[PDB]
Structure formats: C-alpha cells, structure tokens
Symmetry: D2
Subunit: 106 residues, 4 copies
Amino acid sequence: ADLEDNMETLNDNLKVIEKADNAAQVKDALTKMRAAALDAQKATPPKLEDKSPDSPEMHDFRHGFDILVGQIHDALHLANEGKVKEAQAAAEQLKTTCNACHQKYR
Amino acid sequence: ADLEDNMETLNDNLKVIEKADNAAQVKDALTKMRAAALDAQKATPPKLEDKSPDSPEMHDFRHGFDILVGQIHDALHLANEGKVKEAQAAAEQLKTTCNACHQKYR
Amino acid sequence: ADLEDNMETLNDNLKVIEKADNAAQVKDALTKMRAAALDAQKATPPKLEDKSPDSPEMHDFRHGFDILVGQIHDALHLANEGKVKEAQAAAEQLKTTCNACHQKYR
Amino acid sequence: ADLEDNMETLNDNLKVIEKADNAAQVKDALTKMRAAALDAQKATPPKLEDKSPDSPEMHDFRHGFDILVGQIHDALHLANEGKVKEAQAAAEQLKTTCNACHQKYR
Ligand code: HEM
Ligand code: HEM
Ligand code: HEM
Ligand code: HEM
Ligand SMILES: [Zn+2]
Ligand SMILES: [Zn+2]
Ligand SMILES: [Zn+2]
Ligand SMILES: [Zn+2]
C-alpha cells in the first residue's frame, strides 16, 4: 500500500495497543505495525519527491524505519514474554520515533 | 517480488560484497540486500503455507528477517564509515543468520 | 565509577551534543556516553538495593541499558558518517530511553 | 575484572548454555555473559596496548562487544520467552562473533 495507508495502520494499531488488555492483542497489533512499517519503507514521501533516491534525506528517511522496525521488533519480544505493560510502554516510546521523522519529512 | 527472487538478490550481492573492492560497492550491494530482505519479509515460505499467518513458525520466520535486516543495517554503517574490510566481515557473518533460517524453514 | 557519576557524564555529553558544531565533537561525546552507560550498567540502583540480583526489575533495569547502548552505538555510526544533524536527532531521541528507566527505577 | 577473567566467564556460561536443560539456566548464564561482555568492553587487549585509545583498532575492538552484547540481549529475550532451543541456537551462533574478534585481536 501507500504511505498514508501504512501510516493509518501504524497509528491505529498503536491505539489498539494503548487500549489493549491481553498480550495476544498487543502482539498482533505490533505485528501489523511491523508490516505497515516495512511497507511504508519502500515509499517516497511527498516533501522528498524531488530529491534523488540516494539523497541524504531519502537515506535518513529510510534509516528512520530501520529504527522504528527495530523498536517494534523488541516490543514484540516483550509481548511474547507476556509482559503486556512494559510492551505498551515500548509502544508508547515508539512515538518519539514517529514524531522525529514527521518533523524532518512530513 | 517473490522469495526465490529476493533470495537470489540476497545471495548475489553477498558474493558481490565478498569480491568487492571499494566501499562504494559494498554499500550499494548491502543496500540491495536490505531491500531484498525487507521484501522477502512479507512472503510466506513453502514449508509454511499450511501454517496460519500468526503461527509460532511464521512469527519466528519473520523474526529472522528482523535479525538479518538489523545486521545488514549495521554492516551498512561500517561501509559508510569507509571500513570495507570489517563490513565484509559483517556480511560474511550474516550467513550464520541466512543458514539458521534455512534449516528451520527451507 | 558509580551511577550518579556515569549519569552526570551521560547528561553532560548529551548537552555537549546538543550544542555540538562539528561531527568530531558529537562522536567523542557519544563515545563518552557509551562508556558511561556501559559502566552505569554494572551498578545497582537505590530503589532496587533490596531486590535480588536476578530480580525481574534488576533484569529490566539492565535491559534498559542494552537499549540505551544500542541506540548510542547507532548514533555513533551516524556521527562517523559525518551526519551531524541526524546524529543529534538520534541523541535527542535517546532521552525517551533515559526517561523510561527513570520512571520505573529513579 | 580483566579480559582473561571475563573471557573465561564468557566461555564457561556458553558451555553451560549448551548443556543447559531449563530456560532458567540459559537465562542466568546469558545474563552472566552480558556482564562479562560489558566488562571485557572497558579492557585493552594485549595486541593493542601500543595503539592509542581512539585507534581504528581499539574502536573496532569495542564495536565487536556492542555486536556481542546485542546478540546476547536477543538470546536473553528468547530464553525469557521460554524458547530454550532457539535461544541455545542464538548462543551457538554467538561464537561467530567471538571468533571474529579473536582473529583480529587475539
Ligand atoms: C509508529 C509510528 C508512526 C505512526 C503511528 C505514524 C502515523 C502517521 C499518521 C497517522 C499519519 C497521517 C497522515 C496521512 O497519512 O494521511 C502519518 C503521516 C506520515 N508519516 Fe508517520 N507515523 C509513524 C512513523 C513514521 C516514520 C518513522 C516516518 C518516517 C520514516 C513517517 C513518515 C510519515 C510521512 C512522510 C507522512 C506523510 C504521508 C502522506 O503523504 O500523507 N512516519 N504518520
Ligand atoms: C543474506 C542471507 C541469505 C541469503 C544469501 C539467502 C539465500 C538464499 C538462496 C540463494 C536461496 C535459493 C533458492 C531459491 O530461492 O530458488 C534461498 C532460499 C530460501 N531462503 Fe534464503 N537467504 C538468506 C536469508 C534467509 C532468511 C533470513 C530466511 C528466513 C527468514 C530465508 C529463507 C529462505 C527460504 C524459505 C527459501 C526458499 C525459497 C523458495 O521457495 O525457493 N533466507 N535463500
Ligand atoms: C542518556 C540517557 C540518560 C541520561 C542523560 C541520564 C541522566 C541522569 C542524571 C543527570 C541523573 C542525575 C542524578 C544523580 O545521578 O545525581 C540520573 C540519575 C539516575 N539515572 Fe539516568 N540517565 C540516562 C539514562 C538512564 C537509564 C537508561 C537508566 C536505567 C537503566 C537510568 C537510571 C538512573 C538512576 C537509577 C538514577 C538514580 C541515580 C542515583 O542514585 O543518584 N538512567 N540520570
Ligand atoms: C561469547 C564469545 C566469546 C567467548 C566465549 C570468548 C572466549 C575467550 C576465551 C575462553 C579466551 C581464553 C584466553 C584467556 O583469556 O586466558 C579468550 C581470549 C580473548 N578474547 Fe575472547 N571470547 C568471546 C568474545 C570475544 C570478543 C567479542 C572479543 C573482542 C571484542 C574477544 C577478545 C578476546 C581477547 C583479546 C582475548 C585475549 C585475552 C588475553 O589477553 O588473555 N573475545 N576469549
Ligand atoms: Zn530488548
Ligand atoms: Zn555497528
Ligand atoms: Zn542506523
Ligand atoms: Zn529478536
């Protein structure tokens, strides 16, 4: 899908996690986020459609996703360890990464 | 693309890296590997077409990519730091991850 | 050294990075933070001096550092790639990790 | 402690993990390895006592530990998820990292 969609996914499951009750939910949600993130990856953001594919910006843009995915990956682990609360914390702190990118490229 | 393709990509650039001379090459090759890995991600391997999307296996399968991608990501950094040799080492040691997955799901 | 010290180090270089001008500075500062974090690691926080060494808390406490170190490591890479700005961003976003631990154990 | 010691620690718990039966053991052992690794970190290897602290080698040397610790961190997660076998696999594959450093600096 396109950015807007994967981003909608990202934001939806994030709220699902915040309202989540069981570790089952959190896991599934995070899993979708990973997918959404990995997909958002390939995309080229509007503010950067004039920049070349191998631009310092496009590279930093892609780097952001590697950070985001790495984080989800870990939060995932926590959910898998049954630790629902600290997994949610992990998800909440993800926002820092979401935001970060938004300033630079949204 | 489909697994076979992204896997071909993955294996080709790996050898490109082993035969690589300049940091420029390694970078580019690793970059391609990231793309191939991230894509291979979405795919569902043959040995697991009967297993549900949220199977312990399908999840572990996906996890391997997170490891692989993470590793490529760091190798990438090394290449960007001009450190061609240790980046190649990083690439060589990636194999451990490639193999790992192959036993369980290839 | 002891927590307070390594923590002071951590917070000092963090501001050094924020006021940093050249990539050389950022690198050096981040390098100090790595050392400081790696050291703070071994330590046992006050709120947890009654808890056993292998407590869920002492483990989570240790995990936080693994996250922090991991992040510093990557920020370091960026600095080495000459990318001073996104390296600073990487540092700023570290705080999320700093904070996270402080709620739970400070 | 000094390198030799942390290294002994590292190699001992590794074998403990290989002979390990319950997830409890694996966790505890890996935890010791982390401590041993993080400590080995600060040290200055013999082959590099003539090189300056900020040498390309001393830096690469330190980087190796960041890789090792990172890996241990993940194995740790697997143990915590009860997955004793794949955690042991994680541990076995760590050796690739152990070796790597030994060629360059042992
Ligand atoms: C889990 C974290 C994240 C969440 C929940 C999130 C959420 C959102 C949401 C809800 C939008 C709404 C606007 C729309 O698409 O119509 C948006 C847009 C956007 N996000 Fe994020 N985001 C996250 C991470 C990131 C990261 C890491 C990057 C950069 C690498 C990024 C780049 C963008 C961009 C470029 C847009 C503009 C899309 C457009 O053209 O409409 N986001 N984000
Ligand atoms: C850089 C590391 C890797 C390399 C170089 C690599 C390479 C290859 C190659 C050359 C094939 C050839 C057979 C073909 O596709 O026709 C293959 C197949 C396969 N690989 Fe990898 N691989 C890597 C990592 C991984 C990882 C991490 C996983 C698991 C998460 C994985 C899963 C598979 C599977 C399931 C197949 C079978 C594909 C098919 O149906 O043909 N690989 N791989
Ligand atoms: C780069 C991020 C971090 C910065 C800049 C930072 C900074 C600080 C500072 C300035 C103090 C001042 C109080 C003092 O020590 O006298 C402090 C205390 C403390 N920090 Fe951090 N911290 C960071 C990360 C962390 C992390 C990840 C943990 C947990 C694993 C942690 C645990 C603590 C604890 C337990 C104290 C109390 C120390 C005491 O007994 O005085 N910090 N931190
Ligand atoms: C878990 C993986 C590792 C294991 C099990 C391991 C194990 C060992 C063992 C058993 C020795 C025995 C010699 C002695 O100390 O008397 C040794 C030496 C050494 N290892 Fe490792 N090691 C590991 C990782 C590393 C890494 C990542 C580095 C580099 C960053 C490294 C650097 C060294 C060095 C420099 C020595 C020489 C110490 C001396 O002066 O005696 N090792 N290692
Ligand atoms: Zn973790
Ligand atoms: Zn690295
Ligand atoms: Zn990075
Ligand atoms: Zn993992």
